[PDB]
Amino acid sequence: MAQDIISTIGDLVKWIIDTVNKFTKK
């Protein structure tokens, strides 16, 4: 449960960091 939610938020964070390092906000 909490570990899987945190792991999933980490996986979202990977995509946010990729998308950020690409477009660091435009």
Side-chain angles (χ1 to χ4, degrees), residues 6-25:
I6 291 163
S7 303
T8 305
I9 292 165
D11 303 320
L12 299 175
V13 160
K14 297 168 192 170
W15 323 143
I16 295 164
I17 291 167
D18 302 331
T19 308
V20 164
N21 294 15
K22 292 167 183 179
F23 302 91
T24 304
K25 303 182 181 180

